[PDB]
């Protein structure tokens, strides 16, 4: 099936041909003797950018059909009465006229609907609660299959939310074949890369050291559009290097042309150009891990080891495809940096972070929709990891009252128990600072484990933290050590950094005194 | 290019002379053309002058001009027949003299009227076919002018029909100076203009003006000067004896600028100065301490690498002067971006509107390099009442989230909050969000009160002696705003009763912390 420009979905094409188009090619005598009608429509669903329109157009070309009619669902709607039904009803006129003129010796017409789900939703049974666009659904239903029969038409619908469509449109008489187009695996990526490099290979522009196998390995959660963009970016970078070399030196042009071959362009474009939508993002770790991770004691190693064990469990287990964990500790302890570190070290193809910093001013329904979208995207991969940060800020909790949002709480409670499709695995990491409230809400038994993130509690630990940060000198270090050798401290790393920064603003002589005064003004016990 | 009498569009005419007539002036052998121009802009910018002077400069036949929708007719086939009469001479010359044919210029005024249903579409089709059809002409130029470029048919703007698109804009200061020189040269030549008038001041003053408005202003000045020699009420007169000697002073121009002509554009309103009315008077040490703390915080924000975000809270009892000192600190910060968020600008709003306004302010702040924002009257922002109690939780959560979101990489932000109810904020668990706090006290002793009264200078020595006898030996607890209110209330009565009334009010307001 890769001779038509489509690679990675041979099985889907074969099944579609067997179930839909076997009677279009079989001789017309036996198909009349049997007395069987033709399939009238099909439905295709999957993530965007995976080759649905391409397949529809190729199918249209395959059976010597006429030029297809392409429609976008959202742009049919009008605000005047009878104007959206007329738009729907205009699409069948040519087919009706041709059938009336020619009877059974007519051609084939094809209609392609894009974002079909935007105009076909379940009709309201209750009186007075009818939908806004019920008339459009009724018109489409009566046009696809009605009292007057059409036998020279084929309808192809494309969507990403197949669960919102009316069930009368999907009966064995209307759009009875359905197929899913998912992300490609290594073999499909290799096929797509081979297809998209044909012109370069033919025109003698590739290098001898270009290995499409290794590049197929490197890309992990790419769609076809991503790979095409990668190839174009690589060629552009090669052209840029050619311009650089030509403009810098008086070199002979033949060497410049020989430099047109590309092996380092691919890797350069991989890092700095292409950002997959179902892959990991390196621009978030900088935001959440800003000052690194310094080892001021043993507990950090314990936390990291526990995270590593949980990752190993989720990777290699069949009876438990879903695992959860809660990180809890006192304020300013540093729970959002360690959860990001554990997520980063997992090395899963899909990593995402959900935070309330991107939901300022939202109502609870919008927040629910955002969380649901994140999890829906998560379910399309084979290994996934998700991080839910500040569980008390997503619920809008205030001690007076108390007051909070119940919709988000129920959504979280249901989401903590739902497993992905068969064979796919997910890990969830949540961070909080008020675990008594979560115990009172009965949310703590929805998690599988808990990990404690403690504070700094001894003088030697504080001195080690200061040494690692490297701010005070030997004499000041001796003064501090003699004054805080007593192991009765209680401080967080973030607040320690803030205190150091505030202390450093004074005159050089009055700096240790200010630091010690600020430290004393702080707390000293739980 | 000022000879033609239009200023501020020299560069546009340079572009015109480059893109239009270079091929016609360039030697024919090396050549061995463009036939469309569209001028658009706001009214009164000189498009008609441009068209007329373009028609005059070229050595060609007299241009043909159609004034608006004269083509339309009630009968069938006349509207289209009217168009074909325009190109007859051009076709004749093309067919007879061939290449060696004179240029033809066609001017369309208010062309949006006829280009944009049987009549209009046929007219447009006929024009399109005639301009660019099977027979190709190379000696015709068509010029159109518009004030609403967005109402013209797209098919008319494609290459080969209307190629040179030009915009006329409001002239800048040098263009306005050129226009004033053009319109005042005639007066200057005959010594009818006074020596006190300066063109530069007029050019600086007339902001947002166009050429027509400037000429109207000049005309208004002339009329103001002229009416001095006109008598009315009983009959119209010319004076003559004094009319012969007519000088145009600066006062005439100023008066004409006040009323007769207006810029016709919007104005900007400023509110920051309103937050400090009586200024800051130093009546003690605490003000200096607060200012020093503010300077320390500002410097820490400026020179910090791993603490780009800093927050502060100002504490004090009511009528103690908290917003004024916060505004003073913000002013002394000397940051490129400074703004004040107040509940006075949001009256009758719902929670969503307040959240959107706050988010807009912070979004504007995030764009600069280093910014400072001050929020005052927190309890009013998240409207709070002790009964129940009752408040808006959405705004509280929005503030809590915004208090710990860092700006984009490499940028700095400072936040200063003011309130007079600290226990409530502590209960809401928001006092932890801030990094530090400062306290604004009241006047405690009588010496500070006497110093404040000395600085204000409302009382003389005789009454100050009695006041010192009364207050010096006791502790006091009063704000400054309320102090000024009390002083103003006391001043109303006659000089005899003032001191007794003032001290009676002071005794009424006496209290302890």
């Amino acid at each position: 099936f890769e001779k038509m420009g489509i690679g990675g979905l041979d099985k889907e094409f074969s099944d579609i041909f067997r179930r839909a188009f076997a009677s279009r090619v079989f001789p017309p005598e036996i198909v009349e003797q049997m007395g069987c009608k033709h399939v009238k429509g099909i439905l295709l669903y999957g993530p965007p950018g995976c080759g649905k329109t391409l397949l529809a157009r190729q199918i249209g070309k395959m059976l010597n059909a006429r030029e297809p009619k392409v429609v976008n669902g959202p742009e049919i709607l009008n605000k005047y009465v009878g104007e959206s039904e007329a738009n729907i009803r205009k699409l069948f006129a040519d087919a009706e006229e041709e059938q009336r003129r020619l009877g059974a010796n007519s051609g084939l017409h094809i209609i392609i609907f894009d974002e079909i789900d935007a105009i076909c939703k379940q009709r309201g049974s209750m009186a007075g609660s009818t939908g806004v666009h019920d008339t459009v659904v009724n018109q489409l239903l009566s046009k696809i299959d009605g009292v007057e029969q059409l036998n020279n038409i084929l309808v192809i619908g494309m969507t990403n939310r197949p669960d919102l469509i009316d069930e009368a449109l999907l009966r064995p008489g209307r759009l009875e074949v359905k197929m899913e187009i998912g992300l490609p695996d290594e073999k499909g990526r290799l096929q797509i890369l081979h297809i998209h490099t044909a012109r370069m290979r033919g025109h003698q522009l590739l290098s001898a050291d270009v290995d499409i196998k290794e590049l197929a390995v490197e890309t992990k959660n790419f769609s076809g559009a991503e790979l095409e963009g990668l190839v174009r970016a690589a060629q552009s970078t090669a052209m840029n290097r050619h311009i650089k070399a030509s403009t810098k030196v008086e070199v002979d042009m033949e060497k410049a042309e020989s430099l047109q071959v590309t092996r380092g362009d691919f890797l350069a474009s991989l890092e700095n150009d292409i950002k997959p939508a179902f892959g990991t993002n390196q621009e978030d770790y900088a935001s959440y891990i800003m000052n690194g991770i310094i080892k001021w004691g043993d507990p950090v190693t314990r936390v990291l080891d526990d995270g590593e064990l949980l990752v190993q469990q989720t990777k290699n287990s069949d009876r438990t495809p879903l695992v959860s964990v809660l990180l809890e500790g006192p304020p300013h302890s540093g729970k959002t940096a360690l959860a990001a570190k554990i997520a980063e070290e997992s090395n899963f193809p899909f990593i995402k972070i959900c935070s309330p910093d991107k939901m300022i001013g939202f109502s609870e329904t919008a927040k629910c929709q955002a969380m649901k979208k994140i999890f829906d995207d998560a379910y399309k991969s084979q290994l996934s990891c998700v991080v839910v940060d500040d569980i008390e800020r997503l619920l809008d909790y205030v001690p007076i009252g108390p007051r909070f949002s119940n919709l988000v709480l129920q959504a979280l409670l249901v989401l903590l128990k739902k497993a992905p499709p068969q064979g796919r695995k997910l890990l969830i990491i949540g961070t909080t600072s008020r675990k008594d409230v979560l115990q009172e809400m009965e949310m703590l038994n929805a998690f599988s484990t808990t990990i404690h993130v403690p504070n700094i509690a001894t003088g030697e630990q504080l001195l080690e933290a200061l040494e690692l940060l490297g701010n005070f000198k030997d004499k000041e270090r001796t003064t501090i050590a003699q004054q805080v050798k007593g192991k009765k401290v209680w401080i967080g790393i973030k607040k320690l950094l803030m205190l150091i920064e505030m202390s450093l603003q004074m005159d050089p002589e009055y700096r240790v005194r200010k630091f010690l005064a600020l430290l004393r003004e702080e707390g000293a016990s739980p | 290019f000022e000879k033609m009498g239009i200023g501020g569009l020299d560069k546009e005419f340079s572009d015109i002379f480059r893109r239009a007539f270079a091929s016609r002036v360039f030697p024919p052998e090396i050549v061995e053309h463009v036939k469309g121009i569209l001028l658009y802009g706001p009214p009164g910018c000189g498009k008609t002058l441009l068209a007329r002077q373009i028609g005059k400069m070229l050595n060609a036949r007299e241009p043909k001009v159609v004034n608006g929708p004269e083509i339309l007719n009630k009968y069938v086939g006349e509207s289209e027949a009217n168009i074909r009469k325009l190109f007859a001479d051009a076709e004749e010359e093309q067919r007879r003299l061939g290449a060696n044919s004179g240029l033809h210029i066609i001017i369309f005024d208010e062309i949006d009227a006829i280009c944009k249903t049987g009549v209009h579409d046929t007219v447009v089709n006929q024009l399109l076919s005639k301009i660019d059809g099977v027979e190709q002409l190379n000696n015709i130029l068509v010029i159109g002018m518009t004030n609403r470029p967005d109402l013209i048919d797209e098919a008319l703007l494609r290459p080969g029909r209307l190629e040179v698109k030009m915009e006329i804009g409001l002239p800048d200061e040098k263009g306005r100076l050129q226009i004033l020189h053009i319109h005042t040269a005639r007066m200057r030549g005959h010594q009818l203009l006074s020596a006190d008038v300066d063109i530069k001041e007029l050019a600086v003053e007339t902001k947002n003006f166009s050429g027509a408005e400037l000429e109207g202003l000049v005309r208004a000045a002339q009329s103001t000067a002229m009416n001095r020699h006109i008598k009315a009420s009983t009959k119209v007169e010319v004076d003559m004896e004094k009319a012969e000697s007519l000088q145009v002073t600066r006062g005439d121009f100023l008066a004409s600028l006040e009323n007769d002509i207006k810029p016709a554009f919007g104005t900007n309103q400023e509110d920051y100065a309103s937050y400090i009315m009586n200024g800051i008077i130093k009546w003690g040490d605490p003000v200096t301490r607060v200012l020093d703390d503010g300077e320390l915080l500002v410097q820490q924000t400026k020179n910090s690498d791993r603490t780009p975000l800093v927050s502060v809270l100002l504490e004090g009892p009511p009528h103690s002067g908290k917003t004024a000192l916060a505004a003073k600190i913000a002013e002394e910060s000397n940051f490129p971006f400074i703004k004040i968020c107040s509940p006075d600008k949001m009256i009758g709003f719902s929670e969503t509107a307040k959240c959107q306004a706050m988010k807009k302010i912070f979004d504007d702040a995030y764009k600069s390099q280093l910014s400072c924002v001050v929020v005052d009257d927190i309890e009013r922002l998240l409207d709070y009442v002790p009964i129940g109690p009752r408040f808006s939780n959405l705004v509280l959560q929005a503030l809590l989230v915004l208090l710990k979101k860092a700006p984009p990489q490499g940028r700095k932000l400072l936040i200063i909050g003011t309130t007079s109810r600290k226990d409530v904020l502590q209960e809401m668990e928001m006092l932890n969000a801030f990094s530090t706090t400062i306290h604004v006290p009241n006047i405690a002793t009588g010496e500070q009160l006497l110093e404040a009264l000395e600085l204000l200078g409302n009382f003389k020595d005789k009454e100050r002696t009695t006041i010192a006898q009364q207050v010096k030996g006791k502790k006091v607890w009063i704000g400054i705003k309320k102090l000024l209110m009390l002083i103003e209330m006391s001043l109303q009565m006659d000089p005899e009763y003032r001191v007794r009334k003032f001290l009676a009010l002071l005794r009424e307001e006496g209290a302890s912390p």
């Binding site: 605000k79 005047y80 009465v81 | 009630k74 009968y75 069938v76 049987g118 009549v119």
Partner: peptide, 16 residues
């Protein structure tokens, strides 16, 4: 939403 209501028309004559 509610679908825009019905509206009246004006007419124009032409001679020949």
């Amino acid at each position: 939403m509610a679908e825009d209501a019905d509206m009246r028309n004006e007419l124009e004559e032409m001679q020949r």
